[PDB]
Paper text:
Consider, for example, the Ras proteins, which are prototypical members of a superfamily of membrane-associated small G-proteins that control an extraordinary range of cellular processes. Ras proteins are capable of producing a diversity of signaling outputs by binding to effector proteins, most importantly to the Raf family of kinases, which activate the MAP kinase pathway. Ras proteins cycle between an active GTP-bound state that transduces signals by binding to effector proteins, and an inactive GDP-bound state that cannot bind to effectors. The switch between the GDP- and GTP-bound states is accompanied by correlated conformational changes distributed throughout the structure of Ras. Two segments of Ras, referred to as Switch I and Switch II, undergo substantial rearrangements when GTP is replaced by GDP, as illustrated schematically in Figure 1 (for a comprehensive review, see Vetter and Wittinghofer, 2001).
Leu 120 is in the guanine-binding loop, with the sidechain in van der Waals contact with the edge of the nucleotide base. Mutations at the base of Switch I (H27G), in helix α5 (Y157A), and in distal regions of the guanine binding loops (L120A), increase the rate of intrinsic nucleotide release. We found that the transition between the R and T states can be triggered by one of the hotspot mutations identified in our study, L120A. The two conformational states have been denoted ‘R’ (assumed to be competent for GTP hydrolysis, although this has not been established definitively) and ‘T’ (assumed to be inactive in terms of GTP hydrolysis). Crystal structure of the L120A mutant shows a rotation of Tyr 71, whereby the sidechain is exposed. Additionally, the interface between helix α3 and Switch II undergoes a conformational change. Helix α3 and the C-terminal helix of Switch II shift downwards in the transition from the R state to the T state, leading to a rotation of Tyr 71 from a buried to an exposed conformation.
Numbering used by the authors: 1 to 166
Write the structure that this text describes.
């Protein structure tokens, strides 16, 4: 069956792991354990196609991010995650998009911009600001909450749909 290799990137603490774990394992991780490099694999049906998702959950903390570039190299599509209550994480997206361009040696890489923690109280990134960033890159913007599961399937399956357009 078809395999889609997805990679989740973004700053430390934005919820990359919680998003991935909510998708794959259907629960919310409340604690914060920084990731080095973890992978998940699950068979799903997306738009009628039975396929395998192979998801690489990467480090956002610089301390844990050593060989991240090498892990990312085989990714077919990337979630670029920030948190809507973390302006710096949004400002950092540019760096992740550049890193993706370097590891894929392409300026045409399937990507989705994800504004996570949309359940949070202290929003500092307004939807329109993120829509504009995504528009600049030619990619969709989706908001998610790993806590409530809002948007989580939509985000990952949208990334698959973006891969399928390349
Ligand atoms: N309220 C809320 N908290 C969230 C959400 N997603 C993650 N968190 C919380 O934010 C913290 C960090 O989440 P985590 O998934 O570990 O972040 P990460 O991006 O994987 N961090 P790292 O890059 O160090 O591996 C955790 O306490 C987690 O519960 C969300 O959608 N809403
Ligand atoms: Ca929990
Ligand atoms: Ca993590
Ligand atoms: Mg390169
Ligand atoms: Mg503002
Ligand atoms: Mg398109
Ligand atoms: Na930055």
């Amino acid at each position: 069956m078809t395999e889609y290799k997805l990679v989740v990137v973004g700053a430390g603490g934005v919820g990359k792991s919680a998003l991935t774990i909510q998708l794959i394992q259907n629960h919310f991780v409340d604690e914060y354990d920084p990731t080095i490099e973890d992978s998940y694999r699950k068979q799903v049906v997306i738009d009628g196609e039975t396929c395998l998702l192979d998801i690489l959950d990467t480090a956002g903390q610089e301390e844990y991010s050593a060989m991240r570039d090498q892990y990312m190299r085989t990714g077919e599509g990337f979630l670029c995650v920030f948190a809507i209550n973390n302006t710096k994480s949004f400002e950092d997206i540019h760096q992740y998009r550049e890193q993706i361009k370097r590891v894929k040696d392409s300026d045409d890489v399937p990507m989705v911009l994800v504004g996570n923690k949309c359940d949070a109280a202290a929003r500092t990134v307004e939807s329109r600001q993120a829509q504009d960033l995504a528009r600049s890159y030619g990619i969709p913007y989706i908001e998610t909450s790993a806590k409530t599961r809002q948007g989580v399937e939509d985000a990952f399956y949208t990334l698959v749909r973006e891969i399928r357009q390349h």
